[PDB]
Amino acid sequence: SQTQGIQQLLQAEKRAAEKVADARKRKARRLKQAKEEAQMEVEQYRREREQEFQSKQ
Amino acid sequence: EKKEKQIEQQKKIQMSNLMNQARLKVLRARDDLITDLLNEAKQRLSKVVKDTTRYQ
């Protein structure tokens, strides 16, 4: 009865912590994602700039 | 910026070099021509030596 309600208090706190953990995992995933788009764009800059260099040469 | 500046600088040095060797070629050609003239002159002198009277 009441102890079941207290179990529900604990479980609601648990799933709130699960939401927090999921949000933190989303943040880490987002930062890793940003890392590879950064890699892609810098690769693109290198390509544009080496085609410019061969053009100049 | 580093690589671009290096490349253009080397281009300038190469151009200045090429101009220099052009000038050097023309000048050495001048030298060769004048030395040829001198060689002809000494040959003429050798010819002049042959005649006995004016040589005396």
Swiss-Prot record, chain A:
Coiled coil: none annotated. It is found in: Melanosome; Cytoplasmic vesicle, Clathrin-coated vesicle membrane. It comes from the Eukaryota. Residues 33-53 have a biased composition (Basic and acidic residues). Subunit of the V1 complex of vacuolar(H+)-ATPase (V-ATPase), a multisubunit enzyme composed of a peripheral complex (V1) that hydrolyzes ATP and a membrane integral complex (V0) that translocates protons. V-ATPase is responsible for acidifying and maintaining the pH of intracellular compartments and in some cell types, is targeted to the plasma membrane, where it is responsible for acidifying the extracellular environment. V-ATPase is a heteromultimeric enzyme made up of two complexes: the ATP-hydrolytic V1 complex and the proton translocation V0 complex. The V1 complex consists of three catalytic AB heterodimers that form a heterohexamer, three peripheral stalks each consisting of EG heterodimers, one central rotor including subunits D and F, and the regulatory subunits C and H. The proton translocation complex V0 consists of the proton transport subunit a, a ring of proteolipid subunits c9c'', rotary subunit d, subunits e and f, and the accessory subunits ATP6AP1/Ac45 and ATP6AP2/PRR. Belongs to the V-ATPase G subunit family. This is V-type proton ATPase subunit G 2. It comes from Mus musculus. The gene is Atp6v1g2.
UniProtKB/Swiss-Prot annotation, chain B:
The chain holds residues 58 to 113 of 226 of the full protein. This is V-type proton ATPase subunit E 1. It comes from Mus musculus (Mouse). The gene is Atp6v1e1. Subunit of the V1 complex of vacuolar(H+)-ATPase (V-ATPase), a multisubunit enzyme composed of a peripheral complex (V1) that hydrolyzes ATP and a membrane integral complex (V0) that translocates protons. V-ATPase is responsible for acidifying and maintaining the pH of intracellular compartments and in some cell types, is targeted to the plasma membrane, where it is responsible for acidifying the extracellular environment. It comes from the Eukaryota. It is found in: Apical cell membrane; Cytoplasmic vesicle, Secretory vesicle, Synaptic vesicle membrane; Cytoplasmic vesicle, Clathrin-coated vesicle membrane. Belongs to the V-ATPase E subunit family. V-ATPase is a heteromultimeric enzyme made up of two complexes: the ATP-hydrolytic V1 complex and the proton translocation V0 complex. The V1 complex consists of three catalytic AB heterodimers that form a heterohexamer, three peripheral stalks each consisting of EG heterodimers, one central rotor including subunits D and F, and the regulatory subunits C and H. The proton translocation complex V0 consists of the proton transport subunit a, a ring of proteolipid subunits c9c'', rotary subunit d, subunits e and f, and the accessory subunits ATP6AP1/Ac45 and ATP6AP2/PRR. Expressed within the midpiece of sperm tail (at protein level). Kidney; localizes to early distal nephron, encompassing thick ascending limbs and distal convoluted tubules (at protein level).
